Design a protein around this ligand. Structure first.
Ligand SMILES: N[C@@H](CCC(=O)N[C@@H](CS(=O)(=O)O)C(=O)NCC(=O)O)C(=O)O
Ligand SMILES: N[C@@H](CCC(=O)N[C@@H](CSO)C(=O)NCC(=O)O)C(=O)O
Ligand SMILES: [Br-]
Ligand SMILES: [Br-]
Lengths: 212, 205
């Protein structure tokens, strides 16, 4: 009966894949960003910043895609894989790389998404300069990942976690519609790691059900 | 003893104030940007992105200021105030507003900080407007809720301290807080807490 708003967009898929990994029953509710449903009063009561996702769970409301990941992972900690790790220290590392995704990986990748995939939304002429800068910044981030993932199977250690999962929705864009698969492929450890998490059954199901 | 790198910068103070709220012993170690210490190998082995803070706790290394806040609050959960709330739902709201601070509140305020304190007139106007929109939402929320995550002070409130300190001081835009009655009452509360006053006395500029 848990409900996810806006499943066709990328951020909500962070929540979707966590839910599916955890075997949690849920439903989705469409939100029309193009016509501005997300900026109208009905949706602003759930998410006051007017962005997707938002989750409604019984009496409970929560937004911010990674906060939703953490909440699902904690509420359902005792079933499925432990996406938060086993110890406090393990969880520190999950938190660490989740924050890296939010503050450091995602922002330039967001710029690439917006200006290549949704250029119309950003207006013309397109910012070719910001596109170059964002590609450069993301490559630097990826260089760190390549070194790191050569010493660790997943981001937070030897277990898949929220931190890995958080990279799924927009990196899927990067290697597909954005047209920059080489940024992943040219970095061997990253590429094996990418191949691992994006072929996980939960992610395959997320994509089958909540695209287009 | 736990060690924090770069206490004079704003972002590490999120970790410093959490440590002091929780009554945890720690030491700090300076990072010299002017000499590029942060881009040299020793420091990159602690923090591979070359930014502050970096925290070492015995053999355990952890970075990202809010990740450190969570780690400290979990590890020392049973002492001091509980900055994580009591329930899972409680903690969900702390995570929600922590992410709001990171993804929505801080980026325009970081822009104001870089361009007013450490130097683009247009980007300043745009970022102020963006932050004002963010603050309007906080104003509405803090009317129905004493602190961000509910009726208890939490990591989410504390995460706002260091750069907002800049906003009401050196950046010169205190009116953005003061003109909003609930936001302003909230700021007066959390920024008057002894742990933050002690952080500021010890680690400002
Ligand atoms: N930090 C938020 C950001 C969410 C967000 O920006 N969502 C976008 C859609 S997507 O990038 O995730 O696919 C949105 O609602 N955009 C609408 C708008 O800002 O007008 C989160 O992770 O939940
Ligand atoms: N464009 C807005 C943000 C939209 C966004 O974050 N993301 C994509 C969806 S990625 O799955 C988006 O633009 N959606 C709107 C649409 O599809 O029209 C802005 O100017 O800030
Ligand atoms: Br949708
Ligand atoms: Br310092």
């Amino acid at each position: 009966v848990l409900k996810v708003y806006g499943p066709h967009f990328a951020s909500p898929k962070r929540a979707l894949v966590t839910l599916i990994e955890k075997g949690v029953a849920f439903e989705t509710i469409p939100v029309d960003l193009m016509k501005g449903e997300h900026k109208q009063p009905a949706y602003l009561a759930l998410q006051p910043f007017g962005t997707v996702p938002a989750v409604v769970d019984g009496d409970y409301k929560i937004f911010e895609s990674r906060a939703v990941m953490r909440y699902v992972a904690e509420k359902y900690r005792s079933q499925g894989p432990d996406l938060l790790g086993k110890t406090v220290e393990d969880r520190g590392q999950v938190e660490q790389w989740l924050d890296v995704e939010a503050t450091t990986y995602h922002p330039p990748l967001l710029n690439l998404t917006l200006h290549i995939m949704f250029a119309s939304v950003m207006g013309f002429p397109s910012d070719e300069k910001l596109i170059k800068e964002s590609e450069e910044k993301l490559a630097g981030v990826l260089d760190v990942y390549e070194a790191h993932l050569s010493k660790s199977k997943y981001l937070a250690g030897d277990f898949v976690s929220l931190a890995d999962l958080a990279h799924l929705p927009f990196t899927d864009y990067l290697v597909g519609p954005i047209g920059k698969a080489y940024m992943i492929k040219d970095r061997k450890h990253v590429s094996a790691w990418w191949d691992d998490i994006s072929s996980r059954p939960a992610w395959k199901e997320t994509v089958a059900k909540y695209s287009f």
